[PDB]
Amino acid sequence: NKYLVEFRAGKMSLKGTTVTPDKRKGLVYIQQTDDSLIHFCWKDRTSGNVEDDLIIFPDDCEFKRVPQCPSGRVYVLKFKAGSKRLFFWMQEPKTDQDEEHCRKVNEYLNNP
């Protein structure tokens, strides 16, 4: 099932006010299934297990850069339905495409 956008990222944890990261080589991507729904998933590049698979409709989410993280390229998939924040730190070698991937995420989530 072809992907629509993919890029190496890892995960992080939001304890209280404190976003803590995860060490695994993960990957973020967006996939369209045969019934057309748009999924936002994250899978373990190591084991290959897909730990996250969310069906996303226009206006569900924003995928944004996180300013409070200087030491990493932290992005947050955030929901208007509540306090579901989902944190990811870019694991790509070159930062050249961080911002294109951020745009294309938002684009496919909200313009499918």
């Binding site: 190496r8 890892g10 992080m12 939001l14 006010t17 404190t18 976003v19 803590t20 990261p21 995860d22 060490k23 080589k25 996180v66 409070q68 993280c69 030491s71 990493g72 390229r73 932290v74 924040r85 944190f87 730190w89 870019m90 694991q91 790509e92 070698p93």
Partner: peptide, 12 residues
């Protein structure tokens, strides 16, 4: 190669 994890940061 591949970046190092970020240091924990407060979320605001």
């Amino acid at each position: 190669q591949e970046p190092e994890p970020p240091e924990p940061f407060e979320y605001i």
